[PDB]
Design a protein around this ligand. Structure first.
Ligand SMILES: Cn1cc(/C=C2\C(=O)Nc3ccc(Cl)cc32)cn1
Ligand SMILES: [Cl-]
Length: 260
């Protein structure tokens, strides 16, 4: 299976809409990550390509090129390979230590700050989208449902992303408008909870009940593992159900748990 200079190898991950395969470039003798898409909507993908083309940051995955044939049903996005894969799998019985969670969370902060400055809402922040590169640092991946905005913030109404990480204000049943940056903060909070507990803070196999818990269940910390009180404070502020009082990224950067 060869596509121009690339030989397609085995699957390595899930992308938004498609699959991600390891790929070998015969021109430069180098492995890449290739997202394969079958046209089944397509406007969302070219916005993703358009977003990826504008981005250049150490904590954000790089799009290398796009293989688009108006003849073939398949479309190929070639990314840099982030060789060590996701930072963790959720759920797990072996979560990160606090020191590891802080190390990775610092990369997540820098990446999100950059995305928001570039006027991008990621909308699908979660551990499986935080890939560990050759030097051990995080690269944010999967911009399949991301939004670009003008001005100070996005004003959104559509519900997209991974359900366990969706912010409560995005789950109104009345097409209400909500702002974008606070959505990424909420998902960063679910992610940090995942880092140290190995499972999501709101869980239910019934999607109605999952939504109801995100919107209405008080955050609860498990007795074990016993995490520091300032980390509990930071998670609590990021998982504030009210997006208006939810901690903002400039404050996360200063939080005493982050800076120690
Ligand atoms: C070792 N490993 C790599 C992956 C996946 C990816 C990778 O490397 N670059 C990517 C760029 C964009 C997307 Cl959406 C996914 C990946 C999974 N496991
Ligand atoms: Cl995940």
């Amino acid at each position: 299976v060869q596509l121009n200079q690339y030989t397609l190898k085995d699957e390595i991950g899930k992308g938004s809409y498609g699959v991600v395969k390891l790929a070998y470039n015969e021109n430069d003798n180098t492995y890449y990550a290739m997202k394969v898409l079958s046209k089944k909507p397509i406007e969302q993908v070219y916005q993703e390509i358009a977003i990826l083309k504008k981005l250049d940051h150490p904590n954000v995955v790089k799009l290398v090129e796009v293989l688009d044939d108006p003849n073939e049903d398949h479309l190929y996005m070639v990314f840099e390979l982030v060789n060590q894969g996701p930072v963790m799998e959720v759920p797990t019985l072996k979560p990160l230590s606090e020191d590891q969670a802080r190390f990775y969370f610092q990369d997540l902060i820098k990446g999100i700050e950059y995305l928001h400055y570039q006027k991008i809402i990621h909308r699908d922040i979660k551990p499986s989208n935080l890939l560990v590169g050759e030097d051990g640092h995080i690269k944010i991946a999967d911009f399949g449902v991301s939004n670009e905005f003008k001005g100070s913030d996005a004003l959104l109404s559509n519900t997209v992303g991974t359900p366990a990480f969706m912010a409560p204000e995005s789950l109104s049943e009345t097409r209400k408008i909500f702002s974008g940056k606070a959505l990424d903060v909420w998902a960063m909070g679910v992610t940090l909870y995942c880092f140290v507990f190995g499972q999501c803070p709101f869980m239910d196999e019934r999607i109605m009940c999952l939504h109801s818990k995100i919107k209405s269940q008080a955050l609860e910390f498990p007795d074990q593992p016993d995490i520091a009180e300032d980390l509990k404070d930071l998670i609590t502020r990021m998982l504030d159900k009210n997006p208006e009082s939810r901690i903002v990224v400039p404050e996360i950067k200063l939080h005493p748990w982050v800076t120690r």
